[PDB]
């Protein structure tokens, strides 16, 4: 079979969007003072 | 002295995973 029989779809809902963005900004708020030193 | 490298690191660590999550969210909410 020349077309791939395993082409599959990623899925990311709005709850996970808010969790990921909140994780990235909280990590930034924490580490930013130590990075800028 | 302030980390001019560090401000670029801050901006990159903001923008790159943010865009990575936005791509997946817009791909997801496009179908439904």
């Amino acid at each position: 079979a020349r077309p791939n029989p395993n082409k599959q779809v990623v899925e990311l809902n709005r709850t996970s969007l808010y969790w990921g963005l909140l994780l990235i900004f909280v990590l930034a708020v924490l580490f930013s003072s130590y990075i800028f030193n | 002295e302030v980390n001019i490298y560090g401000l670029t690191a801050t901006a990159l660590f903001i923008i790159i995973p943010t865009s990575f999550l936005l791509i997946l969210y817009v791909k997801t909410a496009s179908t439904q």
Binding site: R14, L22, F25, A28, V29, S32, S33, F36 | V2, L7
Partner: peptide
């Protein structure tokens, strides 16, 4: 210079809090 970065990060965290509270998906029934 870095004070603006600090303030931008705190305000962005509060903004994500705001959008998470009010613009969520509705938890729907059966």
């Amino acid at each position: 210079m870095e004070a603006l970065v600090y303030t931008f990060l705190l305000v962005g965290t509060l903004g994500i809090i705001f959008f998470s509270i009010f613009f969520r998906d509705p938890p729907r029934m059966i």
